[PDB]
């Protein structure tokens, strides 16, 4: 048994880290509708920029 490395199966998040930064704002082409061909647009429950 020669000693080598091994990516071990302990899933402990101590001595390891992810860069949990802020979630980016999603692009939203689905929100506002063209009511009849014209501007009757909708939000439908988000921070719609």
């Amino acid at each position: 048994e020669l000693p080598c490395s091994t990516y071990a199966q302990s899933t402990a998040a101590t001595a390891e880290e992810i860069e949990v930064h802020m979630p980016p704002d999603t692009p939203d082409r689905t929100l506002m509708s063209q009511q009849s061909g014209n501007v009757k647009i909708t939000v439908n429950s988000q921070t719609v920029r």
Partner: nanobody
Amino acid sequence: QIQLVQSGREVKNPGETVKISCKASGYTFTEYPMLWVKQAPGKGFRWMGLIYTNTGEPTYAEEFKGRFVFSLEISASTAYLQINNLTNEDTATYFCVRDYFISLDYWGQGTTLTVSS
């Protein structure tokens, strides 16, 4: 408000052109197009797309491929349908629809394109 004052008689030859520029009173800028409409002899409505007044050009019809293509004078708030290469059945009515009254809420009354021998 929204009202596309459509052009008069658009005379066309066999394979000739058609151009109905409709001066769109109520050419806005903000949030909505002007739903253009082709008008056949019996069909009632036949939508030629959405295209704004200060938007400027029409997102055209779907099944109207052939001659028809939307255009407009964007700074004047005016739209138009130009249909070059005039076939036999090119005689029809044209309209815009200005998105105030938040559907296509300024319906064009019709512009008479007459392309015949």
